[PDB]
């Protein structure tokens, strides 16, 4: 969904002090503790996405702050005043009490309307609405920059459509928008796809194996319809025909699904047989060089009545020549015909899905590839096998080959269909990628025959069309995981391992961090979806140890991960939280100083004893101020003559928090600036308790002078900005037109049903 | 009677929205070109998340 | 200081068997006829144990 954001974080908050006389607006975004000693980066990190959660930007959203306004009681006025933001009635009745310590007149009405009136909405030739409102500068800019960013991704339904087109099959039934929705009809979508290799070519074997049993679960289930003759007859059998029939579907569904059969050790005329059929009716490239050798072995083994051994040692060509002599023309094996589908494959941006056709068959021809067969059954008919007188042999083998040859000519189309809708199932890098590495699906040799023997045409009814509507949705959604978990795990590979030596240290170093990368990512809500542990436990494994293995292999990966918008987000907000560190509570170096030493401050905010400078003085009474590490520090034993002079505090980051008081009084600090242990020394937190000042007060100016010894300076924060410069704080913000509508469902088709 | 059904109340919309909606609820009650089922998705991609 | 052989004949560097033909000679047991001309299942048993 794309939720929508009613009012904009302003952030600001108006501080005056009781005469009025000072008054200062301040941006509030929180403190965040940060740890020295380790990286800043990766601590920025963290604290990025609970700044996005903060300011309501971590999940995509659209701006609708158009109708936040009212308008005024003048007839001439005709402008809409935004009700975001810091309301200008606070900025002026703090400015009417500063004008009342001075003994000024009030604000006249010219210059109250002006003031009241800097607040407005309204819209550009686009047709948004802009609304410039009084707002902290870092809340601007992200905010901004976040709308930015999701509104990559929201565009036009009809350019939508434009984009979805190629993919959209005939048989479903166009859809119907409304005609708001056609000029109006706006829509957030990713439109990237991740590559599904990383996973795929990693674990081959794993992947393979989870895909194929997938699709045969379901090929499995389809709607059917219903002497060495002798030999023939007894081993036809039909109890396996639903496990072979989805084996050939899965040989013509993808590019190279290698099958293997496995012949008895004494061969058979049930082997010669089994061996013609694959050797004829099944796809070239489904057969291996091996198996193209085994199978014309046994062949020869049969009909020239000569053993294993001889045969072990001849070749390809050999067996072929030695085959033809005896009567045998059915020594090739025959490519199949690619089929082009007529629309694009999914997760296949711009390109061509194909699949073989089944049992060999030309679909111009709508015969077999070979021009030759009715010849060469008659050769079989007539021939002498088995160095014997009688035909037995040869005139049984041309009556089953016809009988196979008329079976797979009628049923040939049922198949054809049966594959072009699970071919569309899959994608096209599985389609090149997925390999039989474990032979898992080996078929019998009396399989093989009484498959195509009695083979029965394929029925496909409503009930089957409409359960593989329901899997082609759960295949979507399967794929659409495994690419955002391979991006994710893409991503986590590259920022927390590195390389590995052949040094004990760095193994062990790599051990440790894996494990606890390993630890944190499995607890709460783990971060790979259940899709993907499947995958990696089809061996056996553990889903922590599968993924352990995976993580330890992308190591070194090239493979490139597409910047999504949320990332950028979380890019700006860290390289501010860097960049701007007083606005989160955090600084740099610190300052400090004896009481009589006079150094510049910052004296916009009318503070008494103002501990922020605009920048730490470089020099002070002519000579350049001693800096030195808070590691130096901790260890300085003669730290009692050191901080007679005064110094600065670097190389650490220092969190401090100040409570701006209104009244007046001495500006201290809650506890003592150092700790001096045997082990070291120490900083204690800083707390500052900043009073407004009042010049006349001898009593509060004496104290300030004796009281405290020692002072703390740090720079100013940004946050902080005087009253007088209320005019830096305005800011626009920008939302899109009310008349949008957003469409949850942007399928174009409808379900034939 | 120009309509047996009235595609939606006038008064009760309040944007561009509501129209849809009110459109989409009344649609039983129209000749429709095509009688709508369930959806068919041939494109879906999952973003990351915060 | 010292040195040690590291277990498995894994090389750290390639994360990998020391034999950059593992995987290619697995498949071809798996694929190959022993003992007999005709299968045994050697091959199988054998390949699905070393993988």
New interface residues.
């Given amino acids: 969904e794309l939720i929508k954001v009613p009012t904009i974080p302003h952030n600001l908050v108006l501080i005056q002090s009781d005469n009025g006389k000072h008054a200062l607006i301040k941006e509030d975004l929180g403190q965040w503790p940060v740890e020295t000693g380790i990286s800043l980066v990766n601590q920025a990190g963290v604290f990025a996405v609970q700044l996005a959660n903060k300011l309501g930007i971590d999940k995509p959203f659209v701006l609708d702050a158009g109708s936040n306004y009212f308008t005024d009681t003048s007839f001439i006025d005709t402008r809409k005043y935004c009700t975001d933001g810091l309301s200008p009635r606070e900025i002026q009745k703090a400015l009417n009490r500063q004008r009342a310590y001075y003994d000024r007149p009030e604000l006249t009405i010219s210059e109250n309307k002006t003031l009241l009136s800097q607040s407005i909405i309204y819209p550009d030739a686009d047709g948004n609405d802009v609304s410039i409102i009084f707002s902290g500068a870092m809340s601007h800019a992200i905010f901004t920059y976040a709308q930015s960013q999701w509104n990559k991704n929201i565009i036009k339904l009809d350019d939508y459509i434009r984009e979805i087109t190629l993919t959209v099959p005939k048989q479903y039934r166009p859809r119907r928008f409304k005609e708001i929705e056609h000029t109006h009809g706006y829509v957030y979508r990713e439109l990237n796809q991740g590559s599904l290799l990383p996973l795929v070519d990693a674990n081959l074997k794993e992947s393979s194996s989870y895909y194929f049993k997938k699709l045969m679960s379901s090929i499995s289930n389809v709607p059917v319809d219903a002497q060495h003759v002798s030999m023939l007859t007894n081993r036809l059998t039909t109890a396996n025909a639903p496990t072979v029939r989805a084996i050939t579907v899965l040989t013509c569904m993808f590019k190279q699904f290698r099958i293997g059969m496995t012949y008895a050790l004494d061969p058979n005329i049930m082997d010669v047989a089994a061996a013609t059929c694959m050797l004829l009716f099944r796809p070239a490239q489904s057969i291996s060089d091996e198996q193209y050798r085994y199978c014309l072995q046994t062949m020869a083994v049969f009909l020239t009545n000569t053993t294993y051994d001889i045969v072990n040692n001849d070749t390809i060509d050999v067996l072929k020549m030695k085959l033809r002599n005896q009567g045998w023309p059915f020594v090739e094996r025959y490519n199949a015909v690619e089929i082009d589908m007529s629309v694009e494959p999914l997760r296949s941006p711009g390109q061509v899905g194909r699949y073989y056709n089944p049992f060999n068959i030309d679909p111009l021809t709508k015969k077999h590839v070979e021009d030759r067969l009715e010849e060469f059954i008659n050769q079989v008919q007539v021939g002498r096998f088995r160095n014997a007188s009688g035909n037995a042999v040869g005139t049984t083998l041309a009556a089953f080959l016809r009988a196979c040859r008329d079976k797979t000519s009628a049923n040939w189309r049922g198949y054809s269909v049966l594959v072009s809708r699970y071919r569309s199932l899959i994608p096209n890098e599985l389609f090149e990628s997925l390999r039989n590495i474990s032979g898992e699906y080996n078929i019998n040799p009396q399989d093989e025959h009484s498959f195509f023997f009695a083979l029965a045409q394929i029925n496909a009814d409503d009930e089957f069309i409409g359960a593989i509507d329901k899997e082609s949705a759960e295949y979507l959604d399967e794929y659409a995981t495994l690419a955002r978990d391979i991006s994710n795990s893409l991503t986590l590979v590259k920022a927390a391992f590195g390389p590995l030596e052949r040094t004990s240290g760095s193994i062990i170093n790599h051990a440790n961090n894996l494990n606890k990368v390993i630890n944190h990512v499995f607890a709460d809500k783990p971060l790979i979806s259940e899709t993907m542990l499947k995958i990696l436990t089809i061996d056996g494994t553990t889903g922590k140890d599968g993924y352990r293995n995976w993580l330890d292999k992308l190591v070194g990966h090239n493979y490139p991960v597409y910047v999504e918008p949320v990332v950028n987000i979380m890019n700006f907000i860290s390289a501010r939280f860097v960049a701007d560190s007083s606005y989160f509570g955090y600084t740099n170096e610190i300052m400090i100083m004896p009481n009589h030493i006079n150094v510049p401050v910052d004296d916009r905010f009318g503070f008494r004893d103002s501990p922020f400078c605009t920048s730490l003085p470089r020099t002070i009474m002519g000579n350049d101020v001693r800096r030195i590490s808070y590691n130096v520090f901790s260890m300085m034993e003669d730290i009692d003559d050191v901080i007679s002079e005064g110094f600065i505090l670097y190389d650490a980051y220092f969190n401090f928090s100040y409570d701006i008081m209104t009244t007046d009084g001495v500006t201290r600090l809650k506890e003592d600036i150092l700790i001096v242990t045997d082990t070291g020394n120490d900083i204690k937190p800083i707390h500052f308790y900043i009073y407004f000042e009042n010049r006349n007060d001898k009593k509060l100016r004496y104290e300030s002078k004796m009281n405290v010894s020692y002072r703390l300076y740090i720079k100013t924060p940004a946050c902080l900005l005087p009253l007088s410069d209320y005019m830096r704080a305005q800011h626009d913000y920008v939302s899109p037109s009310s008349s949008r509508v957003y469409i949850k469902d942007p399928a174009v088709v409808y379900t034939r049903s | 009677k120009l309509f047996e059904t009235s595609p939606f109340d006038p008064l009760t919309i309040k944007?561009?929205?509501d129209?849809?909606d009110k459109?989409?609820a009344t649609q039983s009650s129209s000749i429709?070109?095509?009688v709508?089922?369930?959806?068919?998705?041939?494109?879906?991609?999952?973003?990351?998340?915060?």
Avoid at chain 2, 36 to 50: C, D, H, I, N, R
């Fill in positions: 944007n561009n929205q129209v849809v459109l989409y429709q070109e095509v709508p089922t369930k959806t068919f998705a041939t494109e879906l991609q999952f973003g990351v998340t915060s």
